[PDB]
Amino acid sequence: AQHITPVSEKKVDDKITLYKTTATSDSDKLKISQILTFNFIKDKSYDKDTLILKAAGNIYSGYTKPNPKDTISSQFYWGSKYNISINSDSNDSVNVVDYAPKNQNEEFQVQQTVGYSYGGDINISNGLSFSETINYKQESYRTSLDKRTNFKKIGWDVEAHKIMNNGWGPYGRDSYHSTYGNEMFLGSRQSNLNAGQNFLEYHKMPVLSRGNFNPEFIGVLSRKQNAAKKSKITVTYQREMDRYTNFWNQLHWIGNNYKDENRATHTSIYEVDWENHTVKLIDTQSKEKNPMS
Numbered sequence: 001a002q003h004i005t006p007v008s009e010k011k012v013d014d015k016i017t018l019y020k021t022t023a024t025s026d027s028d029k030l031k032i033s034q035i036l037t038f039n040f041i042k043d044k045s046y047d048k049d050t051l052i053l054k055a056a057g058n059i060y061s062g063y064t065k066p067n068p069k070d071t072i073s074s075q076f077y078w079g080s081k082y083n084i085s086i087n088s089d090s091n092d093s094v095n096v097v098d099y100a101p102k103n104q105n106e107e108f109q110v111q112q113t114v115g116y117s118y119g120g121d122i123n124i125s126n127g128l129s130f131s132e133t134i135n136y137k138q139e140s141y142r143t144s145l146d147k148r149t150n151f152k153k154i155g156w157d158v159e160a161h162k163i164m165n166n167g168w169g170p171y172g173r174d175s176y177h178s179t180y181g182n183e184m185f186l187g188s189r190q191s192n193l194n195a196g197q198n199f200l201e202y203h204k205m206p207v208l209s210r211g212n213f214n215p216e217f218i219g220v221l222s223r224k225q226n227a228a229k230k231s232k233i234t235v236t237y238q239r240e241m242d243r244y245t246n247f248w249n250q251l252h253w254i255g256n257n258y259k260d261e262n263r264a265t266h267t268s269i270y271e272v273d274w275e276n277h278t279v280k281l282i283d284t285q286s287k288e289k290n291p292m293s
Contacts, residue, residue, distance in 0.1 A: 001024070001025070001026055001028075002023075002024060002025040002026075002268075002281055002284060003023070003024045003025075004021060004022070004023045004024075004279060004280070004281065005021055005022045005023075006021070007019050007020070007021045007276070007277050007278055008020050008021075012041075012129045012130050013118075013129060015043055015044040015045050015118060016041065016042070016043050016044075016116075016118060016129055016130065017041075017042050018039060018040070018041060018130055019039075019040040019042065019277035020037065020038065020039050020040070021037075021038045021040075021277065021278060021279055022035065022036065022037050022038070023036040023038065023268070023270060023279055023281070024036070024057075025266070025268045025281070025284045026057075026266070027266045027284075027286035029286065029288075030060070030264045030265075030266060030286055030288055031058070031059075031060035031212070032057070032058070032059050032060065032237050032239070032264065032265075032266040032286070033057040033058045033266075034055065034056075034057045034235060034237055034266065034268055035055075035056045035057040036053060036054070036055055036056075036057075036235060036268070036270075037053070037054040037056070037132070038051060038053055038272075038277075038279055039051065039052040039053070039054070039130070039132060040274075040277040041116050041130060042277070043116075043118065043119070043120060045118060045119055045120075046119055046120040047224065047225050047226065048120065048222045048223060048224050048225060049222065049223045049225060049274050050097075050116060050120065050122070050220060050221075050222050051219075051220065051221045051222075051223070051272070052114055052116065052122075052130075052132050052218060052219075052220050053086065053218065053219045053220075053221065053233070053235075054132050054134070054216065054217070054218050055084055055086065055215060055216070055217045055218070055219070055235055055237075056214070056215060056216045056217075057214070057215065057237065058212050058213075058214055059079075059082050059212065059213045059214075059215065059237050059238075059239050060079075060211075060212050060239070061078060061079025061208060061209055061210055061211055061212060061213065061239060061241075062077055062078070062079050062239045062241040062262065062264055063076065063077060063078050063079060063209065063210040063211075063241075064076050064077045064292055064293065065202075066195075066196045066199060067196045068194055068196040068197045069194065069196055070194055070195045070196030071194055071195060071196075072195055072247065072248040073195050073245065073246065073247045073248070074194070074195035074196040074198070074199070074245065074246055075243055075244065075245040075246075076185075076199070076243070076244055077241040077242070077243055077244075077261065077262060077292055078185070078205070078209045078210060078241060078242055078244055079208060079209055079210070079213065079239050079240075079241055080159065080160045080173055080209070080240055080241060080242040080259065080260075081157055081158065081159040081160065081239070081240040081260075082157070082158045082159075082208070082213045082215065082237075082238065082239050082240075083146075083155060083156070083157050083158075083236070083237075083238040083240070084155060084156050084215050084217050084235075084236070084237050084238075085146065085153065085154070085155030085156075085234075085235070085236045085238075086153070086154050086155065086217075086219040086233065086234070086235050087152060087153040087154075087233070087234045087236075088152050088153070088221060088231060088232070088233055089152070089231070089232045089233075089234065090230070090231050090232040091223070091227070091228050091230065091231035091232075092227075093223055093224045093227030093228060094221055094222070094223045094231045094274075095151040095152070095221065095222055095223075096149075096150075096151055096152065096153070096154050096219055096220070096221055097122065097151075097220050097221065097222045098114070098122045098124065098220040099145075099154050099217070099218060099219050099220060100112045100114050100124050100134055100217070100218045101134065101143055101156070101217070102124060102145070103145065104142060104143065104144045104145070105142065105143040105144075106142040106143075106161060106162075107138075108137065108138070108139045109135065109136065109137050109138075110134060110135070110136050110138060110143060110216075111126070111127055111128050111133070111134070111135050112124055112125065112126055112127070112133065112134055113125050113126075113127065113128060113131050113132070113133050114131060114132050114133070114134075114218045114220065115129075115130070115131040116129055116130045116131065117129065120222075122220050132218055133216075134216035134217060134218055135216055136213075136214055136215060136216045137207065137214070138158050138208060138213070139206055139207065139208070140160060140161065140162055140163050140164070140170075140206035140208065140209070141158050141159060141160055141161055141206065141208045142158070142159060142161040142162075143156055143157070143158050144156070144157050144159070154219050155236075156217055158208070158213060158215070159173075160172065160173055160206070160208070160209065160242075163184050163185075163205075163206060163209070165183065165184060165185065165186070165200050165204075166200065166204065168183065169184070171183065171184035172184075173242055173257055173259050174257070174259065175257070179252070179254075180252070180253070180254055180255065181254040181255045181256050182244075182255045182256055182257040183255045184244065184255065184257055185199050185200045185205065185244045185255065185257075186198065186199065186200070186246055186253060186254075186255035187199050187200055187201075187246075188253065189252050189253055190252055190253070191253060195246050195247070195248060195253075198246055198253060199244070199246065213239075215237065221233075223274045225274075229273060229274045229275040230271055230272065230273055230274070231271075231272050231274065232269060232270065232271055232272070232282065233269070233270050233272055233279070234267060234268070234269045234270075235267070235268050235270075236265060236266070236267040237265070237266050237267075238263055238264065238265040238266075239263065239264050240260050240262075240263045241260075241261055241262040241263070241264075242257050242258060242259050242260065242261055243257070243258045243261040243262075243292075244256070244257050245257075245258070261290065262288065262289050262290040262291070262292070263288070263289050264286075264287070264288035264289075265285075265286070265287050265288070266284065266285075266286045267284065267285050267286075268281065268283075268284045269281075269282040269283045269284070270282060
């Protein structure tokens with residue numbers, strides 16, 4: 001589906017006014033949904049517009065359940081990395097000027113506030129005039145900024161880092177053991193069960209691996225009031241999936257984890273009218289490289 005709310009206008013004081021529009025789009029097939037809050041700040045003291053864009057919603061992990069009948073080898077997809085990107089195009093006077101979360105973060109819950117001050121300053125503080133917050137869980141995962149970020153594009157990756165398995169670990173995507181391989185989701189080294197049963201219990205896996213990630217990210221963009229009034233914003237939500245496998249070699253079990261075996265993406269492109277504080281959908285596209293049952 002897709003929907004854009006009418007612009008709503010709120011005075012923040014006598015110099016500052018907020019014009020808020022919320023754009024939504026989703027792909028039901030991929031279970032990715034975007035909820036984009038466009039907070040346009042117009043400050044009578046400052047000659048640039050400021051957009052504090054919050055990107056929230058849901059990205060399913062893409063986990064697939066293994067079949068318990070699988071005898072001496074089995075496999076499943078899991079959600080190993082999520083990427084959210086925002087890029088600005090078609091107006092050289094629009095720049096990404098701040099964002100949260102910043103730097104890198106392995107906290108179990110990322111909680112920050114983005115505040116606007118009279119005059120144009122933006123301040124980012126830890127924890128929960130105008131401000132907007134992000135709050136999201138990522139146990140076992142860690143958030144890092146896209147290392148190609150610049151004034152036209154920002155993004156964040158949330159990647160599996162420290163996965164525990166019944167007390168063993170932490171395991172990463174490329175964990176290595178010369179006997180047992182990558183044992184991140186292996187149930188036991190010597191099980192008599194079928195392969196499709198010899199994995200870590202679903203509920204003991206991280207929520208981000210087998211459930212849904214609920215991103216909350218903020219990009220802050222500025223635009224000079226005396227320059228062009230339209231621009232394009234593209235917001236992309238992606239999951240990358242690994243394939244975890246196990247195999248009985250006649251003496252013991254081994255695990256393997258093959259990185260980046262599939263990706264599913266949902267992308268929306270908006271035309272932003274900075275003068276009227278409005279966004280209009282130009283397109284959405286949903287894609288997935290290599291689905292598996």
